[PDB]
Structure 1
Amino acid sequence: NMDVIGERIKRIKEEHNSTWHYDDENPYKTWAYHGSYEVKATGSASSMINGVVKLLTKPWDVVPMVTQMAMTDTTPFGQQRVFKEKVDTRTPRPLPGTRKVMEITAEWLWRTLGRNKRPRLCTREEFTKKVRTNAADSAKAAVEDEEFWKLVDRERELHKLGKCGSCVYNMSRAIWYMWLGVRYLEFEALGFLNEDHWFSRENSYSGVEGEGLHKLGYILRDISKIPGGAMYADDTAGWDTRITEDDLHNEEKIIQQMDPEHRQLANAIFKLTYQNKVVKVQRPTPTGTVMDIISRKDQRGSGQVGTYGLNTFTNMEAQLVRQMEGEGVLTKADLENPHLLEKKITQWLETKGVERLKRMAISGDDCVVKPIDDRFANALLALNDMGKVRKDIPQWQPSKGWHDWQQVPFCSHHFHELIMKDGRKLVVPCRPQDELIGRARISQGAGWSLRETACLGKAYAQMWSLMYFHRRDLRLASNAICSAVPVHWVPTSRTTWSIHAHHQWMTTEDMLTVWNRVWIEENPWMEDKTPVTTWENVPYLGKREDQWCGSLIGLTSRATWAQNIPTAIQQVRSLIGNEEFLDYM
């Protein structure tokens, strides 16, 4: 294995020869450990609290989920704990018949996905524009430096020779340039999957890339109209650790559709940074803190460009295989058989494949499947054998599905159908309210001015106005935050890193105008384009649903907070200063 990874380790070893040593009491069991070198401590045990959001959400100061979110450990100790728990494991190799089905399905899926689109290389300009339209942080300075792009060209020439010298994944500027350059080369070779929307619903059938959170519920409601069994949404226990060498080799088949110059670079990303990988992980010792150099041939690097798309691909393939087992196409004897007949798999794929893909909503490891019947609930042989073991359930206990799409969990949410005062229907995203409030109360980093903190606060408030307006407490707290923050102050920093976030709340435009654009004008499931002229006509969940989903409506502490919220708004106002504020209450 040293012929592929040796150069990268040699360069780390050379760079850190001052403190480089082999810690013989290292905790790696399934990863090959190469050595250590001393580093400064990165991360924190707790998270900085957004005082603006906190002062305007007093009843949630006494809420356990809100307190838990205010924690989250990113120190070398925190990193080591998460590593041991999941990452340091081995997935048993799938059986020979399972490997054949996965190969037949992967080949058919890649051909289906590339029926209209052709792969292509992504550029320095695309990457620069992406970095720019995200921060405008030290990545923008690096992208502006010509010396970064020269290092990129040097690394690419090694990749063309089938070599890698600096592409290392992490769990002053020379080390940083090497990381961003690794991500650029990965983006250059595999970025087309995201950039050219290979996993859009129109292109992939099961996919939901570019749809946006506000569309996911409508998609789940459309799947519910398809005749079949219940809707299943099984969670995989640590999906990224379950990506096998067989999965990686199946994912690689995309290179067959590429032009020779693209194929050469994509093949280099697959063979050198995916199928072999060099990882840096911080670890505390009695002497201090060290950085460990580890390596392995399988699993997915969570912080990579191709991760989302390739997890989407493999999950689409895995669910088609589970659907085949459910229908009796794949038996236990077939999975164990190294000479398994290809015919019935190819026949099922060519005659039913696309119809079966349409029964699904797949976003990375998140899946919703509506099979032709409930035999799927007990079709677990191929699923477990592929290594996609369901989280917190005995291996062979049947899956529990849902007969109401509104109960189905997907992408950390569930979705409610609301009836507006004018009879029109809305399909809205929802989650336990404590998770929404707990997240908004967290500020990202330290040394942030009251202005920066208030603007992130405003971003969270406006996200609630657009997506979670149907939650009584969130519309009230959103109106309170927007009344306490100067009107002309632009929301800064992101509220989420989710692929489903389109960030329509990152504006000073009127939120009711934005609401109308998203939910009425641009909404394809809204036949009647009549605008809503008042927030009084923007619906809420039924009181009982709002309460079931965590609302404090009906409690005295909540009624007191609502009554006294202008006092809190005024206190935030007096601390911000003499600025232009607008009263949304």
Structure 2
Amino acid sequence: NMDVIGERIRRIKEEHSSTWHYDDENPYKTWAYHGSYEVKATGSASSMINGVVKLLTKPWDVVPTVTQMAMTDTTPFGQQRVFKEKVDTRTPKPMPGTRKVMEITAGWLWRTLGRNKRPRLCTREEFTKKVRTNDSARAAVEDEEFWKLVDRERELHKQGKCGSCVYNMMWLGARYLEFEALGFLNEDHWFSRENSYSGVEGEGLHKLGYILRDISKIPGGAMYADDTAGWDTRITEDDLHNEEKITQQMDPEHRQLANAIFKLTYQNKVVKVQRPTPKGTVMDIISRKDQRGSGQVGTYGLNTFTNMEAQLIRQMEGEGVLSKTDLENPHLLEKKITQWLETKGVERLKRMAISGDDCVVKPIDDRFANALLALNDMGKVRKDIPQWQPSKGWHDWQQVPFCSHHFHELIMKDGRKLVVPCRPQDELIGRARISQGAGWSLKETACLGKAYAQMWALMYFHRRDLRLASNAICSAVPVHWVPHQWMTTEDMLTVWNRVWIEDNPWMEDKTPVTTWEDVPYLGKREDQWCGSLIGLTSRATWAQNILTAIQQVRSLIGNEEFLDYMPS
């Protein structure tokens, strides 16, 4: 406990020797509380509306989901409330047999993931380049020799000590050191689909639907997509020990630094959290030994790894490999587990799409639906369902939720088929109406709106309202103002052809599309089912007079150069 985190706590208290105290009105139940000092609030109850896209989406002024997205509470008041929900709980220890199959599966999964690639340290030059292309963390620290502070803390890590690696709910220094030891998982694409079979790292939203359709071709039962209640809070001490096994593939200098990250920063953590008190705002210093910190490099990759392991074990239980007697058995035999992993594991990974805590799996049959002993005992309890009620799956991949989307198959006029991402339209419009940052000119606000308009033309062109609104936004913003593929000056029909035709591996016929008229929409019934306002008179009035709203935005912007992108 204190031998690992003590030095960090001593430096925090010494820096704030004035106003340091032990408040017993602290609410912490499952975290170790250490002390508090005096800062005052950072955050807001709601953020600003993007006025450009708001002026151009008037019928959605009267939509409750759009209004709610007036940002969440980042104030210390709102910060303490998120803490009560799930962060301040304890996950029960898994049973001894459960712990063993997790260890066996983790060993096999890391060896499979490391079959072609080798771990490596990441570099100051990589970290610096990443920042520039996107005790405070800015683009201003990497040009200053603050790398000597990084250098001094690394020497502590090499001795098994930690001095200043703390996260809140040098800071950039702690995150560089984590990137240095574990950044290879992301930078060398360990969870790409080719390397991990279940992963989708770097695939991109326009590919996820095609992947789901490919999974549907595998013989088996329904497709299951269970959400876990607060996944990051359900990462156990056993989970962290299993994730640590990647260090066995490292060179000793690398192993030493990654072992320091795992033991001192993941399996012992020191956290700052703001709290309101009748005297004001207060920064509390807390610590615990399990759960995952969301503000960390490698959070995504390690969550993907542990979810891959968890879903494999659930497939195991569905197929009869694991029983309740096995999960309780402290002397469980490895044989049947290893044999299943070596004969079936890769085939079973291919039945899954897994992005962090988000998973889709198509097991060999539907026994999986009621295979819940290991899933619950591992702590990955499903959200908003009785603990032992069978999972409900889908027999249409187009109904499966993944990455906050579902995916529609679209027949183009020329007969070729697209697979497009989609979500309830109010979520897309509600997000595009939110800017963040207080001191943002009309120009920066117009550029962000243009950025949303280009994403809509590239990803959501098939929704009638969004293509209209996207065209209206781009007509209202100067053509020469410029805001992953939707941040450029290229003609959006050109970018569309590159993404959906040219570089699309599921499009055999590379024949380019020459007009937006050849770019299809969802069927009208599906468009309305997914939130379209087409068919309402307030939408027809908006569409009919949209040039008026465009010209009003142009009048206020000034005498810049505008192009008309023809919105009705």
- What TM-score, normalized to structure 2? 0.99
Which residue does the alignment assign to 2:314?
322
* 1:150 counterpart (145, 148, 153): 148
Deviation for aligned residue 1:148? 1.1
Query: What is the CA deviation profile of residues 431-465 of structure 1, one whole-angstrom value per residue up to 9, with x for unaligned ones?
Result: 00000000000001111100000000000000000
Q: Would the aligned equivalents of 2:457 and 2:470 in 1 still touch at CA under 8 Å?
A: yes
Q: Would the aligned equivalents of 1:56 and 1:569 in 2 still touch at CA under 8 Å?
A: yes
Query: What is the CA deviation profile of residues 501-544 of structure 1, one whole-angstrom value per residue up to 9, with x for unaligned ones?
Result: xx111111110000000000000000000000001001110000
Q: Would the aligned equivalents of 1:241 and 1:300 in 2 still touch at CA under 8 Å?
A: yes
Query: What is the CA deviation profile of residues 107-154 of structure 1, one whole-angstrom value per residue up to 9, with x for unaligned ones?
Result: 0000000000000000000000000011xx974544433431000000
Which residue does the alignment assign to 1:42?
42
Q: Would the aligned equivalents of 2:131 and 2:139 in 1 still touch at CA under 8 Å?
A: no
Counterpart-to-counterpart distance in 1, 2:137 and 2:204: 26
Counterpart-to-counterpart distance in 1, 2:68 and 2:511: 43
Deviates more, 1:138-147 or 1:383-392: 138-147
Which residue does the alignment assign to 2:184?
192
Q: Would the aligned equivalents of 1:128 and 1:143 in 2 still touch at CA under 8 Å?
A: no
Deviation for aligned residue 1:162? 0.3
Q: Would the aligned equivalents of 1:96 and 1:337 in 2 still touch at CA under 8 Å?
A: yes
Deviation for aligned residue 1:70? 1.2
Q: Would the aligned equivalents of 1:95 and 1:336 in 2 still touch at CA under 8 Å?
A: yes
Which residue does the alignment assign to 1:9?
9
Counterpart-to-counterpart distance in 1, 2:208 and 2:143: 40
SS in 2 for 1:144: coil
Extract unaligned runs of 5+ from structure 1.
172-177, 492-502
Deviation for aligned residue 1:18? 0.8
* 1:362 counterpart (354, 357, 360): 354
Deviation for aligned residue 1:569? 0.2
Q: Would the aligned equivalents of 2:182 and 2:258 in 1 still touch at CA under 8 Å?
A: yes
Deviation for aligned residue 1:40? 2.1
Counterpart-to-counterpart distance in 2, 1:42 and 1:312: 32
Counterpart-to-counterpart distance in 2, 1:445 and 1:409: 31
Distance of aligned partners of 1:53 and 1:542 in 2 relative to their CA distance in 1, 3 Å threshold: same
Counterpart-to-counterpart distance in 2, 1:393 and 1:142: 47
Q: Would the aligned equivalents of 1:50 and 1:457 in 2 still touch at CA under 8 Å?
A: yes
Counterpart-to-counterpart distance in 1, 2:515 and 2:65: 33
SS in 1 for 2:260: helix
Alignment of 1:61-72 (within 5 A): 61-72=61-72
SS in 2 for 1:302: coil
Counterpart-to-counterpart distance in 2, 1:261 and 1:169: 25
Counterpart-to-counterpart distance in 2, 1:334 and 1:575: 70
Which residue does the alignment assign to 1:499?
none
Counterpart-to-counterpart distance in 2, 1:138 and 1:63: 39
SS in 2 for 1:140: coil
Q: Would the aligned equivalents of 2:369 and 2:390 in 1 still touch at CA under 8 Å?
A: yes
Which residue does the alignment assign to 1:523?
504
Distance of aligned partners of 1:113 and 1:83 in 2 relative to their CA distance in 1, 3 Å threshold: same
Which residue does the alignment assign to 2:94?
94
SS in 2 for 1:126: helix
Which residue does the alignment assign to 2:275?
283
Distance of aligned partners of 1:378 and 1:156 in 2 relative to their CA distance in 1, 3 Å threshold: same
Query: What is the CA deviation profile of residues 70-99 of structure 1, one whole-angstrom value per residue up to 9, with x for unaligned ones?
Result: 131100000000000110000000000000
Counterpart-to-counterpart distance in 1, 2:391 and 2:60: 35
Alignment of 1:375-394 (within 5 A): 375-394=367-386
SS in 2 for 1:519: helix
Query: What is the CA deviation profile of residues 261-293 of structure 1, one whole-angstrom value per residue up to 9, with x for unaligned ones?
Result: 000000000000000000000000111100000
Query: What is the CA deviation profile of residues 339-384 of structure 1, one whole-angstrom value per residue up to 9, with x for unaligned ones?
Result: 1110000000000000000000000000000000000000000000
Q: Would the aligned equivalents of 2:136 and 2:171 in 1 still touch at CA under 8 Å?
A: no
Distance of aligned partners of 1:214 and 1:443 in 2 relative to their CA distance in 1, 3 Å threshold: same
Distance of aligned partners of 1:505 and 1:397 in 2 relative to their CA distance in 1, 3 Å threshold: same
Distance of aligned partners of 1:6 and 1:453 in 2 relative to their CA distance in 1, 3 Å threshold: same
Q: Would the aligned equivalents of 1:142 and 1:148 in 2 still touch at CA under 8 Å?
A: no
Query: What is the CA deviation profile of residues 4-41 of structure 1, one whole-angstrom value per residue up to 9, with x for unaligned ones?
Result: 00101100000000111101110100000000011121
Counterpart-to-counterpart distance in 2, 1:144 and 1:156: 16
Query: What is the CA deviation profile of residues 273-319 of structure 1, one whole-angstrom value per residue up to 9, with x for unaligned ones?
Result: 00000000000011110000000000000010010000000000000
Q: Would the aligned equivalents of 2:136 and 2:172 in 1 still touch at CA under 8 Å?
A: no
Counterpart-to-counterpart distance in 2, 1:139 and 1:379: 45
Query: What is the CA deviation profile of residues 374-398 of structure 1, one whole-angstrom value per residue up to 9, with x for unaligned ones?
Result: 0000000000000000000000000
Query: What is the CA deviation profile of residues 148-183 of structure 1, one whole-angstrom value per residue up to 9, with x for unaligned ones?
Result: 100000000000000000000110xxxxxx100000
Q: Would the aligned equivalents of 1:131 and 1:139 in 2 still touch at CA under 8 Å?
A: no
Counterpart-to-counterpart distance in 2, 1:404 and 1:145: 52
Counterpart-to-counterpart distance in 1, 2:137 and 2:504: 35
- What TM-score, normalized to structure 1? 0.96
Q: Would the aligned equivalents of 1:121 and 1:189 in 2 still touch at CA under 8 Å?
A: yes
Counterpart-to-counterpart distance in 1, 2:141 and 2:243: 30
Q: Would the aligned equivalents of 1:39 and 1:289 in 2 still touch at CA under 8 Å?
A: yes
Counterpart-to-counterpart distance in 1, 2:433 and 2:147: 39
Distance of aligned partners of 1:525 and 1:184 in 2 relative to their CA distance in 1, 3 Å threshold: same
Q: Would the aligned equivalents of 2:398 and 2:407 in 1 still touch at CA under 8 Å?
A: yes
SS in 2 for 1:355: helix
* 2:476 counterpart (484, 487, 490): 484
Q: Would the aligned equivalents of 2:137 and 2:171 in 1 still touch at CA under 8 Å?
A: no
SS in 1 for 2:389: coil
Q: Would the aligned equivalents of 1:96 and 1:335 in 2 still touch at CA under 8 Å?
A: yes
Q: Would the aligned equivalents of 1:320 and 1:357 in 2 still touch at CA under 8 Å?
A: yes
SS in 2 for 1:469: coil
Counterpart-to-counterpart distance in 2, 1:146 and 1:62: 49
Which residue does the alignment assign to 1:247?
239
SS in 2 for 1:139: coil
